[PDB]
Amino acid sequence: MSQLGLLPSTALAIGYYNSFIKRVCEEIHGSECVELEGKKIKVKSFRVDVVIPETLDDNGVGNFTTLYNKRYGLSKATTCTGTRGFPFHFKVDPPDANQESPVDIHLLDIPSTLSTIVESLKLYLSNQVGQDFDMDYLEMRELENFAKVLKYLIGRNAATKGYVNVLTNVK
Amino acid sequence: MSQLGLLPSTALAIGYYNSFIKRVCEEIHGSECVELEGKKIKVKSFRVDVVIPETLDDNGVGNFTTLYNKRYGLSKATTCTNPALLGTRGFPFHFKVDPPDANQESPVDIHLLDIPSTLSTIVESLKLYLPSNQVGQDFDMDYLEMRELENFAKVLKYLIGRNAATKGYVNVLTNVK
Amino acid sequence: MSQLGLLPSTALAIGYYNSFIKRVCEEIHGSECVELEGKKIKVKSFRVDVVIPETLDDNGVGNFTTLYNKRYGLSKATTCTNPALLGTRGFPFHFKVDPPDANQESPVDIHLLDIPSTLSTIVESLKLYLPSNQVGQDFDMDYLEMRELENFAKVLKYLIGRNAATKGYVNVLTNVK
Amino acid sequence: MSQLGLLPSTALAIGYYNSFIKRVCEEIHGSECVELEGKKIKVKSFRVDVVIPETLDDNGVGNFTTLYNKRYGLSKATTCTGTRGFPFHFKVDPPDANQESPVDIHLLDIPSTLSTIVESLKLYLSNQVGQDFDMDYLEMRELENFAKVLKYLIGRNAATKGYVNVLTNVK
Amino acid sequence: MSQLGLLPSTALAIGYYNSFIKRVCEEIHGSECVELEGKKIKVKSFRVDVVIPETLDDNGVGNFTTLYNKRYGLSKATTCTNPALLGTRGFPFHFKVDPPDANQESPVDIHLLDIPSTLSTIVESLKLYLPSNQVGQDFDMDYLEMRELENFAKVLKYLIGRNAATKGYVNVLTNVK
Amino acid sequence: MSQLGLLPSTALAIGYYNSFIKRVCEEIHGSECVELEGKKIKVKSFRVDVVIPETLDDNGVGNFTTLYNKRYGLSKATTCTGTRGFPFHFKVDPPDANQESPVDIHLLDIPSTLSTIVESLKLYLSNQVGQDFDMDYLEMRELENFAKVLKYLIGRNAATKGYVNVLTNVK
Ligand SMILES: Nc1nc2c(ncn2[C@@H]2O[C@@H]3COP(=O)(O)O[C@H]4[C@@H](O)[C@H](n5cnc6c(=O)[nH]c(N)nc65)O[C@@H]4COP(=O)(O)O[C@H]3[C@H]2O)c(=O)[nH]1
Ligand SMILES: Nc1nc2c(ncn2[C@@H]2O[C@@H]3COP(=O)(O)O[C@H]4[C@@H](O)[C@H](n5cnc6c(=O)[nH]c(N)nc65)O[C@@H]4COP(=O)(O)O[C@H]3[C@H]2O)c(=O)[nH]1
Ligand SMILES: Nc1nc2c(ncn2[C@@H]2O[C@@H]3COP(=O)(O)O[C@H]4[C@@H](O)[C@H](n5cnc6c(=O)[nH]c(N)nc65)O[C@@H]4COP(=O)(O)O[C@H]3[C@H]2O)c(=O)[nH]1
């Protein structure tokens, strides 16, 4: 089990689940379509993977997110809607499919909230510039806690259980 | 002098600034345009107000956000993403036109009104930081909630003060409704 | 009198002068021309201002530089490199024309405005020299930051005064915005 | 472990990484093209080698940089863009390739910031003209510290990790 | 009186006179013709001024020299070398024509303006004579620099006064700019 | 090791290096061509030999310089260019080579600054006309100091290191 700590892996995981993963899953289940490039596409079924990098960059996970999106053929799409949508990166299970017919979708998201952890660590613990085993252990433990909490929370909602997966220690 | 605590007001504020406020401010500064219903509008000058609710609801700030967004005009738009950078995503937000009747084709001033959704996390942490066996008005819960909202606002003010991209372009509205 | 210290305002100022200010000044003195959007433009009389920000942002002077370069005209050009010397690289910079509407064909004055990007390093050294466990205005950090900016400006002024190439052709604007 | 010192090898390395290496790596990743002689060439991939000379000259690393660019067929090119470009020296991984098609580029940069170290040494330590073993050791240690800090910082950002190499003690 | 010292203003002045001023004056007196762009021009009456800068730059008189030679006309020429004597080399210098618009074919009065490059060495000696751990305006450095420049000028004056070849044809301009 | 003295070997060597040797080497490296009798010749590679004569003549090294240039087939050439050229005496590595093609050049220079030392010696110490072993020792030591300082400064700049040699005690 996980508990609230001084550096927020549990709370950030809870916020990420309740603000993005739960909401995006519910929106896809309800509307059953995603809007990209000004045009809608139906979703036969969605599988969303949250990718937790093995190590966080000094300046946040934005660079890793951009490189990961470049590596694969990920395309941007928002959840169709006084409430805002949720842009995300996804790929179609087959290389391509007829747009008019519904197409299964493979959402991929690198949690931007992980950037906060970096910041928190800068406050949590230095006047040295080098590999610090204490801070490395802290990063690894916080990433593990984030993944564990997110998995447990996904194991609660029928709208996300089975449809959401966690891929930790990527690259 | 805010810092880290078991209740992550400081960390959530830092994340909100470095993920949405800073990113949105930089994107609007650079592109000088936003996207609404798929069509672009150039932005002459923008301004963002972070509306911190006076008190957080039981189920997050979603209901307050949705009621505040339609009590005012606050049409939904997204900050444009250049075709060059495929990895970066867009940041949807809610905005009004400071002159309500303005030429969309011409450059237009925009007022960005965003209620930090990350505050919802605070609520979901209050149930964990100080679990309550009883249901009803708790004077300790309210004190912690107000203290952490104030910490959030103070952290946002400080962070906005330390960036020319956002300094003077972002204001934090505290104790709204 | 400024000397070496843990915070490298002196060393960074020396490097900035010897690598950009001196090099650009000598290149414009010799070639008497610059490269705007790839096209040659002759320089009649140039002059450089080193815009030292009053306070450095959290993430370096990048955002302040990018907002300053567009608040004013400050189109981007590069100091030309002759084909004979292949090794030497060009130094891009931002400049305006003192008469904004001037014939590019004929020799034209240019006002070079450069916010030293090296100042960013100072910020990244403040996080090392005096680490802080808390986020918020620190009156000790502000003192060190302003002292280091003052040292940078003073060293730049001195080094400019000791070279006919840069003496009088370079000005240090301190405490800007 | 590297910390701030009186003669700035660590701070100069941090500035070099955050101002040139990181910025150039991200710009190449994003734009995926470099402008040379005023015309663009696409970049399938890039490798950035930062060359730390064995010994810094008395007047700075400028002469070594010019000689290095002369010895190899390195060509000048900026990063396409109120922000400026980053001119650099690069070489294409075959002898030549069709410009229309994307071509891999091997950037080679001798950090000009190393010049500052020379100046710093002049302030750090003499009224003599000869091989000063004390200053020689100081220069060697500063070059080693610069290389170590730059390697560590390269190993942090996903936009430079694996794509940037450090060649220390060259010639 | 001027004598030898650790800072070699006297020795450098002696070398400058015996190597450039005396040689150039004697060669112009004899040949009465110089070489501009490879083309011979006859000299009717010449005169040399040794422009001693008021203050020496940090990196030698190179920048001041090349900026003075361009602020005024001062086209570069070289004293002609007779084909008979192969061993002797030429002495390039910068000169203008006292009447700016004069016939090159006919004899022409020439004004030779030379900023002693040897003064650069003095700077390189001041760093050795009185090493400084700090960078900034030093009142002791300035005194030594001005004293050495004045000694250089005085030695040049004396040496010129002692030779009919250079007496009355060479003037030392002290404290220029 | 060398330091400033009353009769300037070190300062004269520094001036010779920074005013002729460094400048000439840099200009040859840059322009890669030398002008002789008004026509340019490309330089494939250059070697600069600075000759320190065994003993300085009474009137200076000018007469020795003329004799040395007479002995060999040295030819005059300036460095192409508000900066002046640097006339010098050079020789082609082979007996002759095609003008159009680049040709190696063995620049040969007898430092005229050495003449100054003679005058310096006249001021350093006599009312006799004869062999003064004291003055001979001073002259030899000063020539050694000049050669040592010039050798050291040559191995400091990458533009002159390896391309410049010092031939002390010639004839
Ligand atoms: N692909 C994708 N992921 C999303 C989106 N919204 C949230 N997330 C993820 O969920 C984290 C926390 O969301 P939050 O509680 O709503 O709290 C958010 C939220 O209140 C605000 N924010 C972030 N992005 C946006 C946005 O695009 N529009 C608006 N109006 N607010 C945003 O900043 C706070 C912190 O954001 P992060 O630290 O980066 O971390 C976010 C992010 O990793 C989305 O629209 N698309
Ligand atoms: N407008 C303009 N300013 C210039 C330029 N080059 C240097 N500066 C300024 O001079 C400072 C020191 O440069 P550096 O010592 O040669 O040492 C630099 C250099 O080694 C490298 N670097 C910086 N910019 C470039 C570039 O544009 N091209 C290449 N190839 N290297 C660069 O990073 C070091 C530190 O950079 P900074 O922190 O940014 O700080 C730079 C920067 O503020 C230029 O081309 N244009
Ligand atoms: N305008 C002009 N001025 C001249 C010329 N030759 C000498 N001078 C001046 O006389 C000073 C002393 O010359 P040096 O004793 O023969 O001793 C000189 C000489 O051995 C050598 N050197 C300097 N310039 C040249 C050159 O142009 N050609 C050659 N072959 N050697 C040079 O470096 C020594 C010190 O040079 P500096 O520090 O520059 O200082 C030089 C320089 O200021 C000349 O041809 N044209």
Author numbering:
A (entry chain E), D (entry chain A), F (entry chain C): 146 to 226, 232 to 275, 277 to 322
B (entry chain F), C (entry chain B), E (entry chain D): 146 to 322
Sentences from the paper on this structure:
Stimulator of interferon genes (STING) is an antiviral signalling protein that is broadly conserved in both innate immunity in animals and phage defence in prokaryotes. Here we use cryogenic electron microscopy to determine the structure of the active Toll/interleukin-1 receptor (TIR)–STING filament complex from a Sphingobacterium faecium cyclic-oligonucleotide-based antiphage signalling system (CBASS) defence operon. To define the molecular basis of STING filament formation, we reconstituted signalling of the S. faecium TIR–STING (SfSTING) antiphage effector in vitro and used single-particle cryo-EM to determine the structure of the activated complex. In each SfSTING dimer unit, the canonical V-shaped STING CBD is positioned above two TIR enzymatic NADase domains that dock against the base of the receptor.
In response to the nucleotide second messenger c-di-GMP produced during cyclic oligonucleotide-based antiphage signalling system (CBASS) immunity, SfSTING rapidly assembles into oligomers that form single filaments and antiparallel double-filament structures that make supra-molecular contacts between STING and TIR domains of opposing filaments. The TIR domains are not as well resolved in the main double-filament class, probably owing to conformational heterogeneity, and we therefore focused structural analysis on the single-fibre filaments. Additionally, a modest approximately 2° shift between packed SfSTING dimeric units is observed in both the single-fibre and wrapped double-fibre cryo-EM reconstructions, resulting in the active SfSTING filament structure adopting a slight curve.
